[model samples]
Structures are given as C-alpha cells and as structure tokens.
Target: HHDMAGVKALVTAGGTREPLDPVRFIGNRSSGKQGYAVARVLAQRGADVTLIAGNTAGLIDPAGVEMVHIGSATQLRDAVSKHAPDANVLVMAAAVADFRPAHVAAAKIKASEPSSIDLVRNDDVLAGAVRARADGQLPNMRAIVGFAAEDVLFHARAKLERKGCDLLVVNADGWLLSADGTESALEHGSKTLMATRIVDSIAAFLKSQ
Candidate 1:
C-alpha cells in the first residue's frame, strides 16, 4: 500500500455512551482490543498511527504513534473529522452508540416510579467521514475501513449496503468476548472468509487505491 513506512493512518476505538441519567448510560461491550491490536500491527509494520480512543480502558501505547481519547459519540465524531483528512487510511473500529437520550438530566434520575428514557439516534461517523471527503474537506482518495459486529446472518450485507466503504471487517458477538481466542470474518460483496484469509485485504486495498 504505497509503502506504508511513512504513510499516515487514523484509527478510532472503544464504544460510545448515551447518558440516560446522571448515573446511567447506554453503551456497548466493545473492549477496544481489536482497535488496539490494529494499532499495534500497523505500527510494527512501520506506519505512523493516530489512535482516537473512546470510553475504553487499558488502551495500548505503541511507540511513535499519537493517541487521543474521547468519552462520548459526539466527541468521537469531532476527533475523527479533525484527523481523517490527513490519513491515507481511516479505520472506524469504534462501536459508536447509535442513539442517545433525548435529554440528559443534570442530577441523577431516581426511580420514584418506573419510567423510560427517550432516545434519539446519533450521526453515522463512517458516513460523515465519506461526506467530508467528497466535499474536499478531507484528504483526497483516502482508503476507508469499517468494522461491524453482527449477530444475525444478513447483518453483514445490511452494513455493507449502508456503509459504502472500501472495506468492511465483520465479526460476531458469539465469537468475540470469550475466554479463548476468537476468529474474525471479513466480508466484501459476495465474499466472506475467516480473518486469517483476509489479512492481506487491507494492504491490497491500500495498494489498489
């Protein structure tokens, strides 16, 4: 991929939280392990990396890479937009919250009586980056990659349809977050295979572009 030795790359990690109350929030179980792994691998391969982490603990620090941290989805959106343009490759590895409470209370909401919180959907970070690039606000001809953790059979297809990115890495919750090592499955168009078979996919995409 155009000699990644000096190429700049940007990666986002962790999961976003949608606050329901002062003490309660909606989020995902993303451990940020994959994002960390990607950063480690890229750095070892000689690429300059910028890791934009969300609300994850125990983030890794690879030598010669820049790391920025954010807590919420809005914050994540801002961070990625700021750095996406300069990167040759942009990895959307973060499990962003799709919805957030319509309104957050200043104080902790107590359950005087059982009640529900209203939520509104958040912006799509992947789509936003593409829009920015198309607008000539970001670096031109950047390669894009997105991650999807789907539980249902057709979920990958739905994601590819919506994301419109150059590459998509698909995994299932059933395989991840286990005691033993889990394998990822990469999907693009009609092709689906184990992560091992797709190790060269990203590099190949980068080279092609």
Candidate 2:
C-alpha cells in the first residue's frame, strides 16, 4: 500500500434529494457503495477519513471513519465547506441534483389534472470545491477527485477539465445496481483492489503537486 499516514481525506457519497413536498423529492439511484468503499480503503491505509453521505441504501458506516449525514444539495455543500479546509484530499462521488424545486410545498401535493413544478439550478458543489482550493480558501486541500457517469468519454473529459479536479472516475450507464455483489468499476478485481488503485493514483498526484 501507498501509506497515506496522517493524511486527511473527505469523501461525499450517495444521492442528494431535492424536496418538492414534505414526502416527495427528486433523487438518483446512487447506492453510496463506491464512495463508502473508497473511504473504507483510505481509512485502512491510515488516512483520517470523513464521509459526507446523503441518503444511502442502508449501508453501514466504515470502521474508524467519521460520517456526516446530509439530505439536500445545499446541505451537502455546506458540510463539505465545513470539513474541506483541513482536508488533504476531497472526493466528490455523490450524485448531487442539478436542480431543485423553486418552492417546496408544506404538504404533499395531491395528484391533480395537471401540475408543473419549476426547478432552479443548484450550486455546483464540485466546482465550488475546486474554486475554493484555487482561491486558497482551503490551502491544505491538495487533491480533488470527481466522478463522471456519462455515456461518452468526450463529456467525461470535458467535465474533468471543467470541474478542475485532479482525477475523474468515469462510468457508463448500468454501472450501478450490479447483482454480482460487485460494483461496475470492479472489473479488474474486488472493491478493495479498485480502491487501492484509486488511492495509488491519488498518492501519485499528491506527490506531483
């Protein structure tokens, strides 16, 4: 292993919810498994791991890792902002919503003949982190990693440059919800192996920086 002793890593996991009503919200299908695996592996490598998680599918917390639960994109961004200043690495693996309902209804809206909900763009959390580091808001933050679950490499490459992250874990459709007890990125080996590879890449990037 790449001995990341004393390194502080922050990882965001799961899917953020955009509430339209008290009980209804827009969310994705992120299981939070990948991000949790990364955090678990980093902790095993002796890094101080802080996992900022949104709604997960009943995943247990990794041992020796601090976890902060959030619900919305705004909350996720706030959590990252609070913890990122002291972090050495930041991994934005969560599927944050791009837009949220302009107004959240106090009660569940009854199904009617026709209904339309207006959406507004949410803050770009990953870009915010990159800008924060670039602007010296988080001087200790050395490496930033983002995920791009796109169908084409062209978009992924564009996002890698657009987000200004050191690395982008690209994924295609049907990558999630695997039934073989393995994540799609685990084509090479077990999740542990994949995590090791990711950590090694991060270590190399840090050394270069």
Candidate 3:
C-alpha cells in the first residue's frame, strides 16, 4: 500500500541555525530523526526523494535520496523556493527557527558581562508555499504535508488550516502522529513508525489528487 511510484517528494529535515554571530546562533531542537526516516522510506517505496538538512551533523544520511545541506531559516527558504515547484509532494519536517537575532555581531561577542540581543520573527516558509499554491506557482502540486511536535496536538488542526497544507503529522508523547483530509492517527510508537504513517498518508493523498 506504500508503493509510491512516480512520486517526487521534497523533505526538509533538521533544525534551522539562526546565526547570531560568526560563532553563535539561535537554533530549533529536532533530531531530524523523523525526517530522515521519512526520506528513507519514501525512497524505498519507489519515490524520488530530496532532503534538505540543517543543523543535524550527528545523524547519518538516508540512502537513495539526494541530500542538500543548509543552515539558517533564510537558506531553508531559498532551498524550498528552488525545489518546491518541481515536486508534487512536500514534507516539511525541519524545526525552523521562528525568530532570529535582530542584529548579528560581525564577530564573536566577547560579552563577559550581561548583554542582550533582540529577536525578530522569521518568515513562515510553509505558509509561503501555501500562497504559491494558490497563485498557481505550484500547478503540479499534489500534497503539502506540514509537521508539529511535542505537546501541540491540540493546535494541529488549526495549524493545518493556517498553513493551508493538505496534511500535518503531529508528534505527541511516544510519537503520536496525525494527518488531515479523512485523517488518521497512530499512538505510541517509534520514529520509524511515525515515518511510515507520514509516508503512507502523503502517498495516498498524492494519488488521490
């Protein structure tokens, strides 16, 4: 049932590193573990998967996929801009920074004393795609799957509507994942199990479209 023949899936993994300086940065915590598994399973299921990774240096690359490395939310936005139009399925699995330091020091901040850095909101990459989809920039688009993590399942439905994506995979305790459009849910499982659920949902949604 997970056979994904002729599908092209664009998946984003890891966490965005918002540079505050040459040496320091703001980051989003995500092992990229789920993202990797999604890419891995998607490839094995006969889809062409392209994975864009951020600050996940420790994780091993998934097989049978093209990997693109990036840092910072801006870079991720650029990567998606370049790649999104070509693919029918999109899995935004990266934990992108919602904010960044307003002013990044030119060099390492030698702040031996208390100092502060202002924060500025970063662009919403997923919403950007939603706009593109409406504007016909992504005419061939089949599915746009977003993700939410850790204690946010209550907000998942609103998030799916807000993002305007076709589906969302929410992570609850022990990896409870979900989706939209005659949705499904899996409770208490491994990351691979999470990935399988995501891949299956996305594949089915794409074929339906």
Candidate 4:
C-alpha cells in the first residue's frame, strides 16, 4: 500500500441536477459509488479527504472526511474553488451537467402543451482547476484526475510514444484501461474493488511527482 500520510485530497462525486422548473430537473446516472469509495479509501490511507457530492441522496458519509453537499453544477464549482487551494490531489469524479435551463420557471410547468426549454452551457469545473494550476493559481495542488467514457475502451501504441500520455483508467464495468491506451477485462465486482486500483494509481502519481 502506498503511504498517503500527509496528503490532502479533494474528490467530487455523484450527479448534478439542472432545474428546468421548480418541479423538474435534468441529471445523469451516477450512483456516487465510485467517488464515495475513493473518498473512503483515501481517508483510510491517511489523506485528509474532502468530498464534494452532488445530489447523492442516501449515501453514507465517509468517516474522517469533510463532506460538502450540493444540488447543481454552479454550487459544485463554488465548493471546489473554496477547497482546492490547499489540496494535493484533486479527483473530479462527479457527473456534472454540461448544460442547464436558461430560465427556470418560478412555478412548476404544467405539461399539457408543447414547449421548448433553452439550455445554457455550464462551466467545466475540472477545466477551471486545470487552468488554475497551469496559471499557478493553486500552488499546492499537484495532481488533477479526470474520467472518460464509461463504455468506450481506448488504447494506443509504441514504447517511446507511451511516455507522453496522461495515465487514464476507469472501471469499465468489469474492465481496466491502461495508461498506454490498452483495455483489460477484470472479474466483475463491487465499486470499492474497482476504486482501489484508481486510488493506488493516484498515490503513485503523487509519489513520482
């Protein structure tokens, strides 16, 4: 096990809800399982963990960690801005909405007539952090991890070319993605089991950095 004794970790999980009206909203299909597991494991490994969750109803909070609950993409971004400066490893695991209704009805919309809702693009929270670090905004932030397609298996080539690629991996249900862009199948299992590999990779990244 890699020792994360003095690390400060920031993890975002779950899915955001973009309110269309007072009664309806748009969202994604994240159970907050993997991100939650990441938070739990980080705490176990001795990192000070702060989990910013989006609409993760009914999930139990990980012990020895700070939990910040949010309902929308805007709130999530704000939460990250407040906590990211002191973080060492930042993981953006939440399924944040790409767009939100341009105008939320003050009252619930009655669904009898055909109508269209205008969607405004939401800010990419991870991108903000990335730019911040690149611009030397977050001096203490050393690593930022992002996720990709849940179903797509991506891989690529030769030894020399492999060194420049960013290590990207995810639990593709029962599969593992290599940094060199190769995919490997794993035995089907719990999210915690899957999250362990990801957590380990992150710690190793920090050590190298």
Tens digits of per-residue lDDT for model 4, 1-209: 54778799999999999998877999999888788988898898888999999978889999999999998999999999999998988888798998999999899877477988889999988878878887899899877776654424433222213322234444424444444355555456677776777777777677677
Clashing pairs in 4: 155-181
lDDT by residue (tens digit), candidate 1, 69-147 = 8878988998987888779888788999988889988888753677778778898989988777778877654577777
List candidate 3 stretches off by more than 4 Å. 111-113, 150-153, 172-181
What local distance difference test score does each model get?
Answer: 0.70, 0.82, 0.82, 0.77
Please write out the lDDT profile of model 3 over residues 1-209, one tens digit for every residue. Answer: 44887788899998999998998898867888889998998998988899999999999889989999999999999999999998888889899999999998898876367878899998999999989998999986788878876435556666776778788777624322334346456665787877787777776666666
**Which lDDT tens digits does candidate 2 get at residues 21-133?**
98999998988887898999899988999999998949999999999999999999999989999899998889999999999999988744887889999999889988988
TM-score for each predicted model, relative to the true structure: 0.81, 0.89, 0.91, 0.85
Model 2 misplaced regions, further than 4 Å: 172-189
Candidate numbers, best TM-score first, in rank order: 3, 2, 4, 1
Per-model root-mean-square deviation over C-alphas: 6.7, 5.6, 2.2, 4.0
Residue 89 deviation, candidate 1, in Å?
0.7
Candidate 4: what lDDT? Answer: 0.77
